[PDB]
Amino acid sequence: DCTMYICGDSTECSNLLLQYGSFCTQLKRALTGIAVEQDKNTQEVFAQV
């Protein structure tokens, strides 16, 4: 979670972070993609029968 990690509970920190753009969209997208990739690997490996 970008907010919790970078800023935490600081609302002014969150306001400053919102100026940086869409870095966190890419971060979360890559993390979810890695998760789905690991799941697909497990499936392709163990669900061949």
Q: In the complex with another protein, which residue's Cβ is closer, 11 or 48?
A: 11
Query: What is the C-alpha to C-alpha distance for residues 42 and 27, in angstroms, rounded to an integer?
Result: 23
> Which of left, alpha, beta for 10 (phi over 0: left; psi -120 to 50: alpha)?
beta
Residues 2-41 that bind another protein (CB under 8 A): 3-4, 28, 32
Q: In the complex with another protein, which residue's Cβ is closer, 4 or 49?
A: 4
Least distance from another protein to the Cβ atom of residue 45, Å: 22
Q: Which residues of the chain form contacts with another protein (CB under 8 A)?
A: 1, 3-4, 28, 32
